[PDB]
């Protein structure tokens, strides 16, 4: 008989939670408080080195009246803060130029192309959500023209189209959407398609093993679990379209779950999927005043 | 009673007298992956006495003009002891940590020192300063091993994010007038049940002096900062030959 | 078929509309969600976490940016000298922009509830001192001296073994919510002014530094709420992302 093999005898796997969530439909009320001339109990003095926030309340610092607070906390939930469609993509199908000149385009999916949505989502390290994507197609002037477009979602490993005549556009198995530009915007819902339990906007590591030389530094921070495929758009036809086209892609999250809040970005964004910043133009978080003693 | 503490794990023991409370990052203790969360079928390895113990990495010098330093976990231990050997022989690793930063000074020294755990601490370069270069940090800067790396722009945390909000993550302060050590227990924070200890750094330890160190000539000028850390609930799976990178 | 009539608002794309959309992947099941630490259910949980308040937002050189996280306290002439002052409205430009509370207020139009600023003394152990931290509600100007500031809400902080004090800025407003205060007519929504004065002197023995620094950490109380989510005028990127 071995005592220590019996003492544990179990992997608890409980993740003992020191705290639990309580229902907080509204901000807490204020209770009546009077003067307290006491010793030993000093609610105002804290120890910020403990790493906890102060547990002091109004009732212990001033003499408060009873306020029945009925202010809802519903709008600060995640499904109220993220369920708002914002611009995540913009594709061009011009008639002349060097960008997508052949009447088709591929757009690898990523939220980090525009500052607003990117900064909203960077607030958390991990997020798990179902997307709702809306496609708004027009001309560069905003004119609505009678053109038929095909949007194909090509998941990783599937053949990307190389021409608007490409056989990949047969979409035998890939999801696709045919929309006339005169129709309303095209709206679809996408599930959570990551191989991991949540998308992560910050991946501190490399995707592959081996020596990490400078020539492969761009692989740093690249999370394949975030690469959900590409969005390919073509003008449905064997001849070049006669209208210059622009497609704006908006996305709103729903059924959102977020983990590990982070400090919010306070520098200009430079590139996609990296925190790169201008070292010679670092700026304070907010405005600066002349003196600490004057406003 | 709340300032004196003893952290005993494995064959190691840390005694502290000028200490604050203990922080359990996000309110959860490290634990073993459950059968419902796990996905890999091979039986994990749980040494539990030869890897779950305190290791002392190395010591920094806190001078009056220090920017601050950071370490990457679990990268700091990928070459130290039986834990390093396990992390090199196995493809999949999982564990929480108990970090203990130590910095003692006289009652006539002053200075504050934020100690923070930042999960998924990605490092951003200066982009050539002007913001035109699509530069990426070198390998030594992303994974500096057990020597850490001295921060270049602590205000933006070398990642474009403000240090002032870094207290939103599990943290403590070493205030030389109050305490001389900080203790943070971090569970396993990842979107996967296991992962590689060589490719992916689960989090980063940051030690940044918010209030500069100060003292008068005649006092001890050398103030060391020592990082100690204990893996907890360590699990390894996917046995193969040893690899370092 | 079934007779129907289309009403105004058809074909419009409201970005905040919450409706059903066509799924692209039939019979698709996501990867199961494992337990991950630190889940967030409400943004208010972040507003109740102390973050450093840049009261000393004077310097702007790229090398002296970290000096914004603390402000100095020194031996004075024992005449109730003024140490620092800032505005108490978290959605306004200034110190509060350094806090998670300020950044989140940037995303909401109206707020309510009591604030709390914790000041931590990071001086020598031998250094003693008393401060007066005063909150002045709206209407009253910036106090010219300690006697005028003492007339508002205030706490008297004594440096000791407990190296932190909490000033609770109570919710004293004519309205239930406050829009973010601003210069102009919206200064109607100003919260007041937080000032710090010397109650006594800053006293040290021989061999201890004559100057220490205070670190301010702001947060929201439990009666805090926000509403009318909007887009932040806090960062305003000035380029495109490559």
């Amino acid at each position, epitope marked *: 008989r071995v005592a220590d093999m019996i003492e544990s005898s179990i992997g608890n796997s409980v993740s003992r939670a020191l705290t639990q969530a309580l229902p907080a439909p509204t901000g807490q009320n204020t209770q009546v408080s009077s003067h307290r001339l006491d010793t030993g109990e000093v609610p105002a003095l804290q120890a910020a080195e403990i790493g906890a926030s102060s547990n002091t309340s109004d009732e212990s610092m001033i003499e408060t009246r009873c306020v029945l607070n009925s202010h809802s906390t519903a709008e600060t939930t995640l499904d109220s803060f993220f369920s708002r469609a914002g611009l995540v993509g913009e594709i061009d199908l011009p008639l002349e130029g060097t960008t997508n000149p052949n009447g088709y385009a591929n757009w690898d999916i990523d939220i980090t192309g525009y500052a607003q949505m990117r900064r909203k989502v960077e607030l958390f390290t991990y997020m798990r959500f179902d997307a709702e994507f809306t496609f708004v197609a027009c001309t560069p002037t905003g004119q609505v023209v009678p053109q038929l477009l095909q949007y194909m979602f090509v998941p990783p490993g599937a053949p990307k189209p190389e021409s608007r005549e490409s056989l990949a556009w047969q979409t035998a198995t890939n999801p696709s959407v045919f929309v006339k530009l005169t129709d309303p915007p095209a709206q679809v819902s996408v599930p959570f398609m990551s191989p991991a339990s949540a998308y992560q906007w910050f991946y501190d590591g490399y995707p592959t093993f081996g020596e990490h030389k400078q020539e492969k530094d761009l692989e740093y921070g690249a999370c394949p679990n975030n690469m959900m495929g590409t969005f390919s758009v073509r003008t449905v036809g064997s001849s070049k379209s006669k209208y210059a086209l622009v497609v704006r892609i908006y996305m709103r999250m729903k059924h959102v779950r977020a983990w590990i809040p982070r400090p919010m970005r306070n520098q200009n964004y430079l590139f996609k999927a990296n925190p790169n910043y201008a070292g010679d133009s670092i700026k304070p978080t907010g405005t600066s005043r002349n003196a600490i003693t*004057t406003l | 009673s709340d300032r004196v503490a003893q952290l005993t794990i494995g064959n190691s023991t840390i005694t502290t007298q000028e200490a604050a409370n203990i922080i359990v990052g996000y309110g959860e203790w490290p634990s073993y992956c459950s059968d419902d969360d796990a996905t890999a079928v091979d039986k994990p390895t749980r040494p539990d006495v030869s890897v779950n113990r305190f290791y002392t990495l190395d010591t920094k010098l806190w001078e009056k003009s220090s920017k601050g330093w950071y370490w990457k976990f679990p990268d700091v231990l990928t070459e130290t002891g039986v834990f390093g050997q396990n992390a090199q022989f196995h493809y999949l690793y999982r564990s929480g940590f108990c970090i203990h930063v130590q910095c003692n000074a006289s009652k006539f020294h002053q200075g504050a020192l934020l100690v923070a755990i930042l999960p998924e601490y990605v490092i951003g370069t200066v982009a050539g300063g002007t913001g035109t270069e699509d530069s990426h940090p070198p390998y030594i800067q992303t994974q500096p091993g057990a020597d850490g790396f001295e921060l270049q722009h602590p205000y933006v945390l070398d990642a474009g994010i403000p240090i002032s909000q870094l207290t939103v993550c599990p943290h403590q302060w070493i205030n030389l007038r109050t305490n001389n050590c900080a203790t943070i227990i971090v569970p396993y924070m990842n979107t996967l049940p296991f992962d590689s200890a060589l490719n992916h750094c689960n989090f980063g330890l940051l030690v940044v002096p918010i209030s500069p160190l100060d003292f008068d000539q005649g006092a001890t000028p050398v103030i060391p900062i020592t990082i100690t850390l204990a893996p907890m609930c360590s699990e390894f799976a996917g046995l193969r030959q040893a690899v370092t990178q | 078929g079934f007779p129907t009539e289309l009403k105004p608002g058809t074909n419009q794309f409201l970005t905040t509309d919450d409706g059903v959309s066509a799924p692209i992947l039939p019979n698709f099941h996501p990867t199961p969600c494992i337990h991950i630490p630190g889940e967030v259910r409400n943004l208010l949980e972040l507003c109740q976490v102390e973050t450093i308040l840049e009261v000393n937002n004077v310097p702007t050189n790229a090398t002296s940016l970290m000096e914004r996280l603390r402000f*100095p306290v020194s*031996a004075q002439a024992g005449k109730g000298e003024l140490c620092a002052v800032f505005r108490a409205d978290p959605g306004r430009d200034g110190p509060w922009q350094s806090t998670m509370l300020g950044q989140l207020c940037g995303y909401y139009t109206q707020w309510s509830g009591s604030l709390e600023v914790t000041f931590m003394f990071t001086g020598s152990f031998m250094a003693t001192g008393k401060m007066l931290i005063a909150y002045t509600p709206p209407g009253g100007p910036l106090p010219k001296d300690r006697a005028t500031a003492m007339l508002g809400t205030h706490v008297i902080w004594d440096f000791g073994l407990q190296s932190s004090v909490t000033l609770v800025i109570p919710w004293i407003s004519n309205t239930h919510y406050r829009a973010h205060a601003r210069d102009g007519v919206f200064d109607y929504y100003t919260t007041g002014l937080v000032s710090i004065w010397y109650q006594t002197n800053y006293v040290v023995p021989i061999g201890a530094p004559n*100057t220490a620094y205070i670190i301010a950490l702001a947060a929201a109380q439990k009666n805090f709420t926000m509403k009318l989510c909007k887009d932040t005028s806090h960062i305003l990127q000035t380029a495109s992302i490559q």
Partner: antibody
Amino acid sequence: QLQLQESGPGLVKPSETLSLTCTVSGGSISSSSYYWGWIRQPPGKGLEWIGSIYYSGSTYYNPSLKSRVTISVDTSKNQFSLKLSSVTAADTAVYYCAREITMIAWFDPWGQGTLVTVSS
Amino acid sequence: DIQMTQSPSSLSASVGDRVTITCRASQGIRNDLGWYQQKPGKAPKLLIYAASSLQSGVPSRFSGSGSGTDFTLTISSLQPEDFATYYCLQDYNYLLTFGGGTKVEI
């Protein structure tokens, strides 16, 4: 309120013993929270602190002038005096006596000022 | 001796403008700096002590900022009566040194 008004000869030819005497009116020189300092300003140039005296006799001299100066305090008549030995041409200036609070860079109130030129 | 360098050595501004004069020491004193004003032919007047404290009676348009190496004195609205020479005085290690002195004239 406190007032300072110093006196001393206006002409001090070289190698003399330049001597001043600063009297305090409307207050007590025997205060434990104040030093008494001497400031020298060459004509048309900046200021230069010489030395401070404590009412108990303790002194703090300028390292450039630690040996050639003597600052003394008479608590009986509420006065303090500066005496310079081995005067030279680089010594002529306007001198002030001020009340000082140590470690705050404080000098207030000041005297009227007395200008002395080294000539024969 | 640690010597303070001031900038600029002279100025010329108008009434109602902001006049900024910097004084930075080689080493760190961290608050042991004061600002003194002097009219031509008169004794210096204590404007600021501890680099931030306004001396009672000094108008609020004078402001001292900074700590450590660099210190700044700002007049929010230069006045005709503010024509004078301004000095910074450091008192470190119980040895006091004045600055170069800047002659602000309108």
